[PDB]
């Protein structure tokens, strides 16, 4: 397992605009596309963002090129903050997998703001990082998928996702 296979799971693939679990216009892997509820707008960013007019739709390599690219920033993003990178850099390399996932969804600003959490992930007090991080927005509205990431920090094994 790895952190393209953890998200795979995560997000799933789907080829077509749709709407995340947020409401907003989406497509290939969790590639937010605009939080703007215009579907033209949507439509407009995604030939943008693939360098083609695609009519709302995709290939499979467009979306796994799409998610490559996602992937890499938001490690880049983690990198360059100074909050982020500190407690990356203090992580084993499955929690930092976990720390990844967080940032894909929420982006590096959501994160950098879980003060506390960090701060616990840092110290490496598993069981109470795994306490504060439940108490959320994020873990009441997508609870399995946080429940699965808090697993990941908490053990550093991939178990959540076998
Ligand atoms: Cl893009
Ligand atoms: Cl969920």
Do not use: C
Not at 15 to 27: A, N, P, S, V
Not at 35 to 53: C, F, Q, T, Y
């Amino acid at each position: 397992m790895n952190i393209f296979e953890m998200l795979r799971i995560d997000e799933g693939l789907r080829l077509k605009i749709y709407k995340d679990t947020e409401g907003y216009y989406t497509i290939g892997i969790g590639h937010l596309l605009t939080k703007s509820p215009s579907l033209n707008a949507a439509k407009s960013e995604l030939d943008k963002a693939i360098g083609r007019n695609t009519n709302g739709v995709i290939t499979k390599d467009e979306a796994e090129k799409l998610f490559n690219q996602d992937v890499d920033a938001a490690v880049r993003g983690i990198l360059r903050n100074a909050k982020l990178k500190p407690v990356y850099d203090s992580l084993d390399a499955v929690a930092r997998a976990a720390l990844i996932n967080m940032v894909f969804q929420m982006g590096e600003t959501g994160v950098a703001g879980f003060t506390n959490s960090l701060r616990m992930l840092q110290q490496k007090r598993w069981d109470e990082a795994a306490v504060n991080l439940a108490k959320s927005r994020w873990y009441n509205q997508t609870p399995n998928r946080a429940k699965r990431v808090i697993t990941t920090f908490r053990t550093g094994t991939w178990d959540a996702y076998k």
